[PDB]
């Protein structure tokens, strides 16, 4: 029924047929991306047209294509040939990861580098990493992955404990040619294992933990209609899944009395970049755009009940396409449940004699992805009181190197001879806002300190100022924790009962933004990451802060290009882009497997309601 | 057995006897504070001496006394007469709160002010508030409370909805004299009620919430020995209770292999101040020192099972003394339980084929206090991975005023004619550190950005710097979110296996500190609140950031006086004082009862362990 429904296997199968009959899916073609398009603005006509966007790669080296097809009609709407040296290469293909280790195993330079280290080539795993854009002129227009080596002592060994430093290779994965092998010298391969399931490492397992049992004897409070539509505790929304972005939230609304009031049209993590801060040439090119280059949705885990998600769990199993257009189900890839969240409101009044306590709860929508050594959980939360929160959970195994004798200013030591380069994990949330409708504006709110003197005789006053961002050219903002800076998204045409515009306040964590030198390649390709908040006027084709083709793209695309239009954003259809991230100096406690660390942001109502929206919560 | 055991009713009763026989507790005496003293440094002799500190007030106006007694021996160790104009008045007495409303009801100026507003004096509640120190010379040496009025329409009415603005009175509660009545003009008393249990306000209660059941079929994982000693998941600590500070944590340690390793000797919230930023003379004197002036422990709630604390709950009922020295039990005043806390660590490894997930959990120790219109929850958390976290939860009813026609730069409008003055809630955590013993130091850690150029050819490098704080005069630090500033407390004489000093990293929320003008009375009395971090050398008598007698104290005492000593803190017995707070611009959603908002801080291991300390957690 709904246009925001998850993609079905039958839809995937029809796209494959449409492309194949049109002659766009021969044996040399691979699908590098396949995703449903959202209904265009003006969906108040039920023009039921399910359209899919496809990125098609060519393993013979012919030009790739972007293709839009209509599943509803069975038509190719458009197909354009891409000049990848201009607009960027397509995302990395899963089948390309292994070709690097296979190609390097037969290259004389690589084998000679391994022989100098007395390493059995059968035991050497190569991590295939995105290449970026640097000094090499021969790579422009070519599909390049770079490879770093780790030794696996036996099939169940954790290779991350055994990095082979001073060695990197570059690989053209279309022509199947090792372009360069760089050996800057022999480092001792760290010898200790990092096998966190080996009893000699864990010691005896604890017997002290008693079970915690979380059950819902009458089932959950939320309902799921038509595959992916959620109603819970006055909230209404649709949960989408895209192979690039992962979980996407659509049509976030709140039932206030008889009215369904929109809040957010679309919420997503639209890019995430992991830049490394080690100046060694072996790794100074290392930056993962996990969303844009690898696609985080396609490596989503199957979540185990009682282990990954605990309690009364409702699963969704989203369907994606493989490289040949076959439907592939991610079984139990999304978990949804409600959690108790402590006290919501409490007061004991001396004068009235009334004692009042209410409990809070939250709805949780979550998925997990694994990209090589790292594992990331994406969690969206909705609270009873109207708060919306996002939380990223970072875990897995840290990326390693040798620890150089005499230490390092850019690498932490984890174990004898074993280092962990400094890095960041930086996210971009794209919030297509719809506070009581599409006429929205953003105000930046700073605390204002006041000087002692006339009108403030005791020197106690303080205030706040709000500045409306009116045009995109002024809508590039930095955090200021010292002045308590927040941003308010309001609707100037929808007033509360006090005749104030309704609004929501964005609270950031105020973590450092991108640390690289502003003239670096990564600062140009990840320009969004240099500023905490961007506001653009909505446009169909402005989907990602880094543009559509991030892999080996020279930079400048995405947000810097969008805001150059300098469009009106004062009471208009706007999109907020919030940058937030973790700066990771690895600690000993992160090894051999890293405890979860978290970062996020939240939005709270700011005069959206006419009074507390949780007065009708019953007393438990 | 343990010297850190909670005070017993029998101990309280013995103190009362000791004071009475010594002639220090006649009919004009009130006990304003009574608390156990911690064992002095060098407790490695089991000199079992339970000593109590008592503050004794005199309702005839004679000089008050500070008195230390030994319960173990039955002796008065010392008794000193206080000159309160010099060192400050004693904390407010609960019996003094009501005398203000009673005194004002017979004063001709007050009655005339009420008659001008057509208010029935039987219907007027006076909030009795601490007086502070301002321009009035006649108040020095006197015990003053100031009163603001609210109308209660009927016995169960919420008086906070009906502030009487333009009116304040000052009351000498020893001599029982109304010193001043200030009437700056008639404001309309806001007419809407704020009765959040009235069905005409709530509407029909939700029937959509299904129960969440949290049970532990084998009981909790922690044990409680000798009243208040907790062992849980390698953690060991003692939970104390003081009528001033509330819950105090003692002897926080972690069992690493065979060794019990100390982390924190004593943790407490040692002061909390609520300054108002409204320049109207009716309220420009308003600042609550909830800990120092009112004592948050004595207004602790009894926590209801299934409502305030949910799950398998273990209660402590601490005992305090009333104004006459009788023991008073706070039934179920402290809740302790463990909670599931999501994923602890997760990795799915392509090369090894091993899929690994572990769940996290936390131990929770919490209590709630109510001071007039506000209610505060204090929560301490211990995590499996060595993290320690504090969280304050602020709720209750906002303090109100009239909303002036034509608006205000310092007051929010909540309802027609009803305002809420701007304010902050600022806490001081006092952390008597003991990282692997008492030889500790503090380093301030900033991210360091590096310029593109030689050695950093690609412009990707970044680093960090650490600065040792060596003397108290340099140990007064501000936050810097932009540079990711944190503080590390280390032990330079205890190394991990990589020969690095063991440490813990303090992560602040970087919220604004005290906003008042630096020349204000409140900036002088709450000087701790102007800076995020202080480090002092330990001393027995340096207990509170604001000194021992905060009520009507002219200011300067506490931390500014302590650090003037300029003592060595580089590898010494040190105390960290962390300021953190909420800046509250009230929203419509905060009325008529405020949803919980939170602020806090956390400490994480930083090379304290030789690898992850949760490798031995079993697989659920
Ligand atoms: Cu990391
Ligand atoms: Cu407040
Ligand atoms: Na280009
Ligand atoms: Na919008
Ligand atoms: Na004084
Ligand atoms: Na200490």
Curated annotation (Swiss-Prot), chains A, B:
Gene Ontology terms, MF aspect: copper ion binding; primary methylamine oxidase activity; quinone binding
InterPro entries in alphabetical order: AGAO-like_N2 (IPR054157), Cu_Am_Ox_Cu-bd (IPR049947), Cu_Am_ox_TPQ-bd (IPR049948), Cu_amine_oxidase (IPR000269), Cu_amine_oxidase_C (IPR015798), Cu_amine_oxidase_C_sf (IPR036460), Cu_amine_oxidase_N-reg (IPR016182)
Induction: By phenethylamine.
PTM-bearing positions, type 2',4',5'-topaquinone: 374
Active site residues according to the UniProt entry: 290 (proton acceptor), 374 (schiff-base intermediate with substrate)
Entry PTM: Topaquinone (TPQ) is generated by copper-dependent autoxidation of a specific tyrosyl residue.
Result after altering residue 374 to F: Loss of activity
One GO BP: amine metabolic process
Domain of life, per lineage: Bacteria
Residues binding substrate: 288-299, 371-376
Enzyme class, UniProt record, top EC level: oxidoreductase
Cofactor requirements of the protein: Cu cation; L-topaquinone
UniProt entry keywords in alphabetical sequence: Copper, Disulfide bond, Metal-binding, Oxidoreductase, TPQ
S-S bridge residues: 309-335
Cofactor note: Binds 1 copper ion per subunit.
E.C. designation(s): 1.4.3.21
Oligomeric form and interacting partners: Homodimer.
Family (UniProt): Belongs to the copper/topaquinone oxidase family.
Function according to Swiss-Prot or TrEMBL: Catalyzes the oxidative deamination of phenylethylamine to phenylacetaldehyde with the concomitant production of hydrogen peroxide and ammonia.
Name recorded for this polypeptide: Phenylethylamine oxidase
């Amino acid at each position: 029924a709904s246009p925001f429904r998850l993609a079905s296997a039958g839809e995937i199968s029809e796209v494959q047929g449409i492309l194949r009959t049109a002659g766009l899916l021969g044996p040399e073609k691979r699908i590098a991306y396949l995703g449903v398009l959202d209904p265009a603005r003006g969906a108040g006509s039920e023009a039921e047209d399910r359209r899919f966007r496809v990125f098609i790669h060519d393993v013979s080296g012919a030009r790739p294509q972007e293709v839009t097809v209509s599943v509803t009609n069975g038509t190719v709407i458009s197909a354009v040939e891409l000049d990848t040296a201009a607009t960027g290469e397509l995302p990395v293909l899963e089948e390309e990861f292994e070709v690097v280790e296979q190609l390097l195993a037969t290259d004389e330079r690589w084998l000679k580098a391994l022989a100098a280290r007395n390493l059995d080539v059968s035991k050497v795993r190569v991590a295939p990493l995105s290449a970026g854009v640097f000094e090499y002129a021969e790579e422009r227009g070519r599909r390049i992955l770079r490879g770093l080596a780790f030794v696996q002592d036996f099939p169940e060994d954790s290779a991350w404990a055994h990095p082979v430093d001073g060695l990197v290779a570059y690989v053209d994965v279309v022509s199947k040619e090792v372009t360069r092998v760089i050996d800057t010298g022999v480092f001792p391969v760290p010898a200790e294992h990092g096998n966190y399931t080996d009893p000699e490492l864990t010691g005896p397992l604890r017997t002290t933990q008693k079970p915690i049992s979380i059950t819902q004897p009458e089932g959950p409070s939320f309902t799921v209609t038509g595959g992916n539509h959620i109603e819970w505790e006055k909230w209404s929304l649709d949960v989408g899944f895209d192979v690039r972005e992962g979980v996407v939230l659509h049509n976030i609304a709140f039932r206030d009395g008889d009215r369904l009031r929109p809040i957010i049209n679309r919420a997503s993590i639209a890019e995430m970049v992991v830049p490394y801060g080690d100046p060694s040439p072996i790794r100074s090119w290392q930056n993962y755009f996990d969303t844009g280059e690898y696609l985080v949705g396609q490596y989503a885990n199957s979540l185990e009940l009682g282990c990954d998600c605990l309690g009364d769990i409702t699963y969704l199993s989203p369907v994606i396409s493989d490289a040949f257009g076959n439907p592939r189900e991610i079984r139990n890839g999304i978990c949804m449940h409600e959690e108790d969240w402590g006290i919501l409101a409490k007061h004991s009044d001396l004068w009235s004699g009334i004692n009042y306590t209410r409990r809070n709860r939250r709805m949780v929508i979550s998925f997990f992805t694994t990209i090589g050594n790292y594992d990331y959980g994406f969690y969206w939360y909705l609270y009873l009181d109207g708060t919306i929160e996002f939380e990223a959970k970072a875990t897995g195994v840290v990326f390693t190197s040798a620890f150089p004798e005499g230490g390092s200013d850019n690498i932490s030591q984890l174990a004898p001879g074993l280092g962990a380069p400094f890095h960041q994990h930086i996210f971009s949330a794209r919030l297509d806002m719809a506070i009581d409708g599409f006429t929205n504006r953003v105000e930046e709110e700073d605390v204002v300190r006041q000087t002692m003197g006339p009108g403030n005789e005791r020197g106690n006053a303080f205030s706040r100022k709000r500045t409306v961002l009116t045009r995109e050219s002024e809508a590039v903002r930095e955090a200021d924790a010292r002045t308590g800076r927040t941003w308010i998204i309001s609707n100037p045409e929808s007033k509360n009962r006090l005749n104030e515009p309704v609004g929501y306040k964005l609270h950031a964590h105020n973590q450092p933004t991108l640390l690289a030198d502003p003239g670096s390649s990564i600062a140009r390709r990840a320009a969004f990451a240099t500023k905490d908040l961007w506001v653009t006027r909505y446009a169909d084709d402005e989907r990602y802060p880094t543009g559509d083709f991030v892999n080996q793209h020279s930079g400048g695309a995405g947000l810097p290009s969008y805001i150059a239009q300098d469009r009106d954003i004062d009471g208009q259809d706007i999109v907020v882009w919030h940058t937030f991230g973790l700066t990771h100096f690895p600690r000993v406690e992160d090894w051999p497997i890293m405890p979860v660390d978290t970062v996020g942001f939240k939005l709270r109502p700011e005069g959206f309601f006419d009074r507390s929206p949780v007065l009708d919560v019953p007393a438990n």
